[PDB]
Amino acid sequence: STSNILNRLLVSYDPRIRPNFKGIPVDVVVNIFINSFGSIQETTMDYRVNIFLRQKWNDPRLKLPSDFRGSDALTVDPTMYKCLWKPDLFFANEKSANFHDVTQENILLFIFRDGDVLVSMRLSITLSCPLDLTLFPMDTQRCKMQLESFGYTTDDLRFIWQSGDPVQLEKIALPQFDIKKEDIEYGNCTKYYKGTGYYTCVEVIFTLRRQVGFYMMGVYAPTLLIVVLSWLSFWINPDASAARVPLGIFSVLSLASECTTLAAELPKVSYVKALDVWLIACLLFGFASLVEYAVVQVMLNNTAAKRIDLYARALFPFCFLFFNVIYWSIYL
Amino acid sequence: MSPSDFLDKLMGRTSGYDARIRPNFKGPPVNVSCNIFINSFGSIAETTMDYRVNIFLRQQWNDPRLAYNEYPDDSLDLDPSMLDSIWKPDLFFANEKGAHFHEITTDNKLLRISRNGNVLYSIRITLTLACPMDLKNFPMDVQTCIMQLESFGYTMNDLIFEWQEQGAVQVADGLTLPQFILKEEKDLRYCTKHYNTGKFTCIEARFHLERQMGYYLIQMYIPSLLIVILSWISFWINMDAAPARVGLGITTVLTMTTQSSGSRASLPKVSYVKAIDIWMAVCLLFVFSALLEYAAVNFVSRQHRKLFIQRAKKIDKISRIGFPMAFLIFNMFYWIIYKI
Amino acid sequence: MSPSDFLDKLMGRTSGYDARIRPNFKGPPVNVSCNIFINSFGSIAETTMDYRVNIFLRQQWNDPRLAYNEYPDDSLDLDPSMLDSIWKPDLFFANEKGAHFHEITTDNKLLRISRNGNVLYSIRITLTLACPMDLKNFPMDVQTCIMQLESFGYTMNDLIFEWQEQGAVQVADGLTLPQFILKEEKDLRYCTKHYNTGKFTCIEARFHLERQMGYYLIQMYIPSLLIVILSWISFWINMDAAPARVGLGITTVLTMTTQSSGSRASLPKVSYVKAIDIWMAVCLLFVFSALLEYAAVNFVSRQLFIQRAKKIDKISRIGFPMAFLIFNMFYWIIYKI
Amino acid sequence: MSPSDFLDKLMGRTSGYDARIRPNFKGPPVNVSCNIFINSFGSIAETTMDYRVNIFLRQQWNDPRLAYNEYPDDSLDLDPSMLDSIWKPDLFFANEKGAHFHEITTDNKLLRISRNGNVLYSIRITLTLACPMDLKNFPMDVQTCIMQLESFGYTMNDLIFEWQEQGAVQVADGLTLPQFILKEEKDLRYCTKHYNTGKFTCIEARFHLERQMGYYLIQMYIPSLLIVILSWISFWINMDAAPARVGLGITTVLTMTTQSSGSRASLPKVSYVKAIDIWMAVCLLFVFSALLEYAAVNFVSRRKLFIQRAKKIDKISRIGFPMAFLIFNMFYWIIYKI
Amino acid sequence: MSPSDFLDKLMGRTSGYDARIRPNFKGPPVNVSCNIFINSFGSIAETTMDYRVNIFLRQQWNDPRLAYNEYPDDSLDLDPSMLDSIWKPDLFFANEKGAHFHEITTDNKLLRISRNGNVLYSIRITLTLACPMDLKNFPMDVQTCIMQLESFGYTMNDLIFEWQEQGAVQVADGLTLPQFILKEEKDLRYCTKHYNTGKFTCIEARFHLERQMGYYLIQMYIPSLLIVILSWISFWINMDAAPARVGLGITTVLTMTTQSSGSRASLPKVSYVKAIDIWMAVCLLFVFSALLEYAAVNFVSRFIQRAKKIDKISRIGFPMAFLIFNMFYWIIYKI
Numbered sequence A: 001s002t003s004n005i006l007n008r009l010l011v012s013y014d015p016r017i018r019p020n021f022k023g024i025p026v027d028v029v030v031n032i033f034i035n036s037f038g039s040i041q042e043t044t045m046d047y048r049v050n051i052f053l054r055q056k057w058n059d060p061r062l063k064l065p066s067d068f069r070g071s072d073a074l075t076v077d078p079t080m081y082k083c084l085w086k087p088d089l090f091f092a093n094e095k096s097a098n099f100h101d102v103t104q105e106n107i108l109l110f111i112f113r114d115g116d117v118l119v120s121m122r123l124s125i126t127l128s129c130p131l132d133l134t135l136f137p138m139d140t141q142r143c144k145m146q147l148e149s150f151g152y153t154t155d156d157l158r159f160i161w162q163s164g165d166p167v168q169l170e171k172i173a174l175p176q177f178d179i180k181k182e183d184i185e186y187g188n189c190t191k192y193y194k195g196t197g198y199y200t201c202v203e204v205i206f207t208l209r210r211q212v213g214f215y216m217m218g219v220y221a222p223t224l225l226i227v228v229l230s231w232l233s234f235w236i237n238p239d240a241s242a243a244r245v246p247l248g249i250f251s252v253l254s255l256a257s258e259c260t261t262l263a264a265e266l267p268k269v270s271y272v273k274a275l276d277v278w279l280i281a282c283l284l285f286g287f288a289s290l291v292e293y294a295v296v297q298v299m300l301n302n303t304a305a306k307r308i309d310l311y312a313r314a315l316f317p318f319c320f321l322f323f324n325v326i327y328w329s330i331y332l
Numbered sequence B: 001m002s003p004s005d006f007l008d009k010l011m012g013r014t015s016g017y018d019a020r021i022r023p024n025f026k027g028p029p030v031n032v033s034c035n036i037f038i039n040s041f042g043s044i045a046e047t048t049m050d051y052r053v054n055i056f057l058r059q060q061w062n063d064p065r066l067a068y069n070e071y072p073d074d075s076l077d078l079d080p081s082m083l084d085s086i087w088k089p090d091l092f093f094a095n096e097k098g099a100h101f102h103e104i105t106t107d108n109k110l111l112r113i114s115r116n117g118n119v120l121y122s123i124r125i126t127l128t129l130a131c132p133m134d135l136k137n138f139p140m141d142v143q144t145c146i147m148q149l150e151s152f153g154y155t156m157n158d159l160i161f162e163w164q165e166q167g168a169v170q171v172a173d174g175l176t177l178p179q180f181i182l183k184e185e186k187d188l189r190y191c192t193k194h195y196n197t198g199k200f201t202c203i204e205a206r207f208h209l210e211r212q213m214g215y216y217l218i219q220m221y222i223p224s225l226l227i228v229i230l231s232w233i234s235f236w237i238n239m240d241a242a243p244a245r246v247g248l249g250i251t252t253v254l255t256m257t258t259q260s261s262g263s264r265a266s267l268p269k270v271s272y273v274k275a276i277d278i279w280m281a282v283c284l285l286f287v288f289s290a291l292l293e294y295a296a297v298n299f300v301s302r303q304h305r306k307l308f309i310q311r312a313k314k315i316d317k318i319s320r321i322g323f324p325m326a327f328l329i330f331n332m333f334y335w336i337i338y339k340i
Numbered sequence C: 001m002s003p004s005d006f007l008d009k010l011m012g013r014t015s016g017y018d019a020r021i022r023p024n025f026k027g028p029p030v031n032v033s034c035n036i037f038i039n040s041f042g043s044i045a046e047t048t049m050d051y052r053v054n055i056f057l058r059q060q061w062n063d064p065r066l067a068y069n070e071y072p073d074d075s076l077d078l079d080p081s082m083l084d085s086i087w088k089p090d091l092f093f094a095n096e097k098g099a100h101f102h103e104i105t106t107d108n109k110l111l112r113i114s115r116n117g118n119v120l121y122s123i124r125i126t127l128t129l130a131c132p133m134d135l136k137n138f139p140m141d142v143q144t145c146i147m148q149l150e151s152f153g154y155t156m157n158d159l160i161f162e163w164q165e166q167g168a169v170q171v172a173d174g175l176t177l178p179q180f181i182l183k184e185e186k187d188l189r190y191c192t193k194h195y196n197t198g199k200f201t202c203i204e205a206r207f208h209l210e211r212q213m214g215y216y217l218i219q220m221y222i223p224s225l226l227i228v229i230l231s232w233i234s235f236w237i238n239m240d241a242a243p244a245r246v247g248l249g250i251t252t253v254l255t256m257t258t259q260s261s262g263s264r265a266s267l268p269k270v271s272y273v274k275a276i277d278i279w280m281a282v283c284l285l286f287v288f289s290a291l292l293e294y295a296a297v298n299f300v301s302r303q304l305f306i307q308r309a310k311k312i313d314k315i316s317r318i319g320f321p322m323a324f325l326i327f328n329m330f331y332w333i334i335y336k337i
Numbered sequence D: 001m002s003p004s005d006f007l008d009k010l011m012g013r014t015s016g017y018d019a020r021i022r023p024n025f026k027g028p029p030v031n032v033s034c035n036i037f038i039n040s041f042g043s044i045a046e047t048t049m050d051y052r053v054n055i056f057l058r059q060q061w062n063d064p065r066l067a068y069n070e071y072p073d074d075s076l077d078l079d080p081s082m083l084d085s086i087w088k089p090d091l092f093f094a095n096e097k098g099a100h101f102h103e104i105t106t107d108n109k110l111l112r113i114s115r116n117g118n119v120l121y122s123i124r125i126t127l128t129l130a131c132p133m134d135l136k137n138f139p140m141d142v143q144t145c146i147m148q149l150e151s152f153g154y155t156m157n158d159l160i161f162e163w164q165e166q167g168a169v170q171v172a173d174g175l176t177l178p179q180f181i182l183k184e185e186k187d188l189r190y191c192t193k194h195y196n197t198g199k200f201t202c203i204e205a206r207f208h209l210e211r212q213m214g215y216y217l218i219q220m221y222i223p224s225l226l227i228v229i230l231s232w233i234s235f236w237i238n239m240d241a242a243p244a245r246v247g248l249g250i251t252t253v254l255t256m257t258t259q260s261s262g263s264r265a266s267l268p269k270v271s272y273v274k275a276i277d278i279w280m281a282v283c284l285l286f287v288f289s290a291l292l293e294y295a296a297v298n299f300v301s302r303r304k305l306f307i308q309r310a311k312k313i314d315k316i317s318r319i320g321f322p323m324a325f326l327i328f329n330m331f332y333w334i335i336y337k338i
Numbered sequence E: 001m002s003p004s005d006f007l008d009k010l011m012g013r014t015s016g017y018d019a020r021i022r023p024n025f026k027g028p029p030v031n032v033s034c035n036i037f038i039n040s041f042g043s044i045a046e047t048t049m050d051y052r053v054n055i056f057l058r059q060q061w062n063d064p065r066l067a068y069n070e071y072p073d074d075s076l077d078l079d080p081s082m083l084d085s086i087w088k089p090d091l092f093f094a095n096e097k098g099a100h101f102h103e104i105t106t107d108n109k110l111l112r113i114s115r116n117g118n119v120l121y122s123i124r125i126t127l128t129l130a131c132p133m134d135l136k137n138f139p140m141d142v143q144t145c146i147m148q149l150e151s152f153g154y155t156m157n158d159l160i161f162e163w164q165e166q167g168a169v170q171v172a173d174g175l176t177l178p179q180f181i182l183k184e185e186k187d188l189r190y191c192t193k194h195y196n197t198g199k200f201t202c203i204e205a206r207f208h209l210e211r212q213m214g215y216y217l218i219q220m221y222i223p224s225l226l227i228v229i230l231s232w233i234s235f236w237i238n239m240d241a242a243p244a245r246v247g248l249g250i251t252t253v254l255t256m257t258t259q260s261s262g263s264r265a266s267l268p269k270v271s272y273v274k275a276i277d278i279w280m281a282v283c284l285l286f287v288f289s290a291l292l293e294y295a296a297v298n299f300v301s302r303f304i305q306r307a308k309k310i311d312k313i314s315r316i317g318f319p320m321a322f323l324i325f326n327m328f329y330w331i332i333y334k335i
């Protein structure tokens, strides 16, 4: 039959022993597919990726004999894959992950003439990457995906990045960010754990630069509206006091409430943020409007305060203009 | 004559049938016809770019090693306990984002045998597939999510997938969706793609879905017109006591901003402008124009006779006669343009 | 004589009985009468169109191959570990949407064997069934949440389920429901449906659920008429405090808007018009009319005139409560069909 | 002599012991006394009518087939690997709403063997119990949550459950609960019941649990006190400042409506009246009446003789209302603290 | 010579080594050496009053039945798939609230054999420890969470645990924590407790945790100061028209109420008074005194010199009291 060759290959074969155990460390290469790069969540400091992991390594015991056909490639099923030897591999920054068994476990086997074999196990991942949340609206995040063996050591097993596709899919269509360059630097992250020695590593980063649209259109326009209402407050008669003060204090209340609500959405970082300082500048501008009107009223009650009021309403708008200009210039 | 012995001699230990061998090895590919049956949609929310479905799944193919000529009857079923004992295809969904089985009181899987040698195997599974939501015309949205079906451990030079031409994607009758609806026409094409390791068969099935306007229509568009009429009556209010109209305009602005913020949260974070944020922004700019018009008429009133007060009344009535017409015609453009 | 030997010779290797073949093969169908026992209802939701039940499930059928004549006693029980060694039905739930077993210290399974060959099998499972929730008259709603039971891998010409007539759906006493009570009478009809591969036996039990008015009634009806009478007392204010009156009116409009928004956000999005939404709309219309006619009376007062304005104000004061009361009476009579 | 040989001859292949047959088969019922060791409460929430516990569990019985006389020492510990090779009860929890083991580094299960054949079996499990909560006097709530412990496939004639009365509900020392402290008393009775398949044993324990008002005192009553004092300062203002006084009135009403809505969010939707809600609603009616009386006195103000009467009425209200609120507060607290 | 024959003759079927019996049976206990190595903290949340860590876990002991003298190399690894062929301890966690393994492409388990007879066995585990969280001085809090590593099915006289001295709890270098930085110093003590069924070995590892002020500092104290200076500018207004001053006071008290409501959404419900809440209460009392003072001066007006004098005295004295209380509170909760 056709299964006789594989059955004879597996009999008298020990999967408990890695190939060339007394020889040189075995050579492994990787081609990490990127199928569905899921949405990233700042509050969890995590993101989800769906990959088609691929590995290749020489295996002299797995040499397909030319007696049957001498096939360039041979294919068997996941049961045979479980029967054969496998290279162990755990994701370093992994925190929750599983397999896929929609009908059965997804494994592909290609067996070469030389003895090199190819396996591929699709497996969904949720990674962890410490976000540099500073300069939040203008950031280029570096979330890293790395592989390394656990049981075996560098003198026993090694990893190399194959000179091939690390990026794959072109129709990624990520919701928020976008990926242009996928360069591999700090590729070898050869890691030492005390009492164990050297462990081979292969590492890759994904460079994701956030766009601006949502934040630009969701917050900045309301801030500008609050500021222009404050400017109109500057353009009101100081004589009235039951209208100018209430609208200004309402504006500062609304601005502060919006600031608190928006600040509560991001993860509770422990240092200043660009959006934070933007909201702070807007809030102090509103408070400046209120205090200048109060001062105008105080001076009016027992020089004229009208000249001061018109000077303020003519000067501070330009102040806000070039202040936000400086803000955008310094953050870009 | 023992029924169990026929099963053993057909497949299993005392048969020579190696389940690790696909039918017709080292020869032509296998056609493997398949057809699905929806049972219940649901939990389709834009927050996660996905939807949950519960479907059946049946494969049809002919196995010469499974061909038999001992039972006089044509049809033949089998206990689901032996499903792993024979070869099965490796059908899998490219976009998965979570899937599982149903293991209630049994493994609810069905297999049937045809007299000639063709086989029928069915299984029910639950999927949560990623739906690439596009939110351009969100209130009037039209959206399709494709269920990628393909093989993994077999190149298309050896395994092929095809649909039954007669109702491959037949659907249940009583199903319904929350504020959505799926149209009857459902396209069916191919998706056979390539990889650095080879190429595999890939069949495709896509749906066309609509969302009923009613919910969003009422719940968000009603307050907009309410605030428009409130600004109109603010215009109708005379100008002697400033704080009255000042507070009315301030409250209208509060309504607009809070309603926009509330509309924002449910819809997922997106960069490109949506279809109803434009409504919210334009209503916000009308109320801003209302308060600015009041500020202008107040400035004209107190700049200092009543000749300019006559002009202030004239511009007040001009606004009162212009904003209704402008708002109506703008609504006509807005509604017409997104319905085409 | 030995119970272990007796069990092995009854079913297992040394029995000649194969668990993989349905009883009375190539003969009459198998009935397998089944009854269910509610043990904990509740955790019902509406945003996801489902409810969770933790129920028992007891099947009854007769297998002639299992007939024994050794033990004098009629009733006999077995270790649940023996269960996987004998034939089982493939009963599943159509509208399933997630369910699982319970493995606490044992797979909670009971097996009993009758002398003639009748067998009783039970299992405790927890389900999350999908219910076509309808919310036309949402505060005064009555719902029919259903469970469809059917086989999967057997045509109905080989297998057809029934229910024991003597209280097939017996229900525990201590169970109670938040914002719900189930009715004692429970309908029971058939649901036999067809598919492309044939037709399978389908059975179902439907439940009627009634939601108490109390919670919604108090907590969201009361602020409505509270603000309505706030507007009513706002009418009694005279023209001098026009900014005060307009501010309080617009703030009442704010209160109605935010209460309505909360009420809508509590309940999942639906296209067809609900019931209480007309209540929020009508209260918003009444407060809007109050503010509108206050503005109109101020305008006519600025533009003889005072007496007519006072007359229309008192007409409104005597009319608005009457219209509100007749509207409430109409609403309550029309939503008790 | 060999421990492996002794284990094989006691249970397993060369022992003649079948784990599928209960001790004293076709005879007297078996006694299974068990005790529950509490290790951690927590995550008790009213939103889903439940509480989560992580407890130990030890059963006690004496299978005559397990008797042995080889090792002189009475005690005998075993690897939980052998656990599947002996008979077990079918113990389960009625109202448990899904639970699981702990598979961390091993299956954390202990089995002990006594010289006479007595066997101790222990297993650590974590539960999520469904507690039929009652929330009538919820601010001062006192609760009775249970855990119905019962067998499943064995009737009166086959299996019984009792308690090791000496510390049956032995609880950990340093544990405590957020917004909860449990009393040392633990009641103990039987849920014994029947079904159409027969009758099964019960044992259960109920834990008296009460919620201390501290956090609820601060977050709930203090803001209401502040708003109502704002209402009396609204009284304290004159009549000519009509927009100011009335704006204070409606804004306090806004505070009240938002506070009433916020408190309702945490608790589940219950038809029957709660205890905090009446407080919030009645002092809401207080501030509403404040605005009502200010409007009424404005109407009275709008030849000049009635102004003095209006001022006198304002003084009477400003005096009486604090007294009414205080006497009502004492009345309500004495009702719901008894 | 043959690796398969060597493994079979060492452990398994044709070895006589039973995996159901602990080493040195009916003899001295196994001393055992166990150490941990952090890989990542994260998810310190007071809402659930627990936290999740991702750590390795290593044990050391000597099994006499595992003694071998064939392979010249001292250190020797083995296939993880044959872990179950040999005995292992039952090291579990006391308060753990549910975990799992990592099964990615293999059970990520490492086994090492020493020539003399020592064995190394390591498994990567992800925990979720319940911490007795305290919130008395919440913004300036110092936290100490513990992990009670111990055995379950073996008495103390039969089995004891111990720590390897050199860097027992060594941590990763570059890890960082939101809202937290752990100090380098970690204590180590025994927790050998008792039960009615006996007594067991028990070990502890406690982490000191300090939470940075920054987030709460800015997002809570800055708006409070803004509202206090809103109250100041309310004082600065003339008495004349009541509505402006009264409305400003109302807006400020609404800000206090809203901030007090929103502050506690993240923090868990706790009976004892917190530290931030007293700040909220005192600033609410400051603005309350401001509004009450304006009501009193309005009553006095409807003596104008006395009213303006007391207004000025309040305007000058209130900031002094605010500053002295501010300094007092900060020294109290900073020393």
Ligand SMILES: *[C@@H]1O[C@H](CO)[C@@H](O)[C@H](O)[C@H]1NC(C)=O
Pocket: A159, A160, A161, A184, A186, A187, A188
């Ligand atoms: C890592 O090291 C191996 C050999 O030590 C080498 O073949 C490989 O190119 C290196 N990879 C990187 C990214 O430096």
Ligand SMILES: *[C@@H]1O[C@H](CO)[C@@H](O)[C@H](O)[C@H]1NC(C)=O
Pocket: B024, B028, B029, B030, B031, B160
């Ligand atoms: C169907 O299968 C037959 C035999 O395997 C093959 O000759 C034929 O080309 C297949 N059809 C397609 C469309 O691949």
Ligand SMILES: *[C@@H]1O[C@H](CO)[C@@H](O)[C@H](O)[C@H]1NC(C)=O
Pocket: C028, C029, C030, C031
């Ligand atoms: C099932 O019961 C019904 C009772 O009318 C009847 O068809 C027959 O007794 C049973 N059918 C079988 C055993 O196929």
Ligand SMILES: *[C@@H]1O[C@H](CO)[C@@H](O)[C@H](O)[C@H]1NC(C)=O
Pocket: D028, D029, D030, D031
């Ligand atoms: C314990 O002994 C037997 C066990 O079958 C039982 O009849 C008895 O009621 C039990 N309880 C006692 C003796 O208190």
Ligand SMILES: *[C@@H]1O[C@H](CO)[C@@H](O)[C@H](O)[C@H]1NC(C)=O
Pocket: E028, E029, E030, E031, E160
């Ligand atoms: C192991 O046993 C105890 C417990 O740690 C310890 O004191 C002793 O020194 C160790 N060695 C021996 C031989 O007992």
Ligand SMILES: CCCCCCCCC
Pocket: C136, C330
């Ligand atoms: C489901 C339709 C209800 C319509 C109610 C109309 C009430 C008019 C007063």
Ligand SMILES: CCCCCCCC
Pocket: A280, E218, E222
């Ligand atoms: C070191 C930062 C102190 C806080 C600054 C806040 C600025 C608004």
Ligand SMILES: CCCCCC
Pocket: A213, A217, B273, B281
């Ligand atoms: C790209 C930003 C558009 C904003 C429209 C209001």
Ligand SMILES: CCCCCC
Pocket: B331, B332, B335
């Ligand atoms: C269906 C067409 C509606 C047009 C409204 C202006």
Ligand SMILES: CCCCCC
Pocket: none
């Ligand atoms: C169907 C669209 C209706 C729009 C009414 C203003």
Ligand SMILES: CCCCCC
Pocket: C332
């Ligand atoms: C049962 C509802 C009664 C309502 C009376 C106004």
Ligand SMILES: CCCCCC
Pocket: D213
């Ligand atoms: C124990 C109850 C105390 C209540 C104090 C107001």
Ligand SMILES: CCCCCC
Pocket: D214, D217, D218, E273
């Ligand atoms: C029990 C809490 C008291 C708080 C006093 C400020």
Ligand SMILES: CCCCCC
Pocket: E213, E330
């Ligand atoms: C870090 C807090 C500083 C406070 C100074 C008043």
Ligand SMILES: CCCCCC
Pocket: E327, E330, E331, E334
């Ligand atoms: C004024 C604040 C000083 C704080 C010193 C720690």
Ligand SMILES: CCCCCC
Pocket: E332
């Ligand atoms: C914990 C000290 C509080 C002091 C309040 C004046």
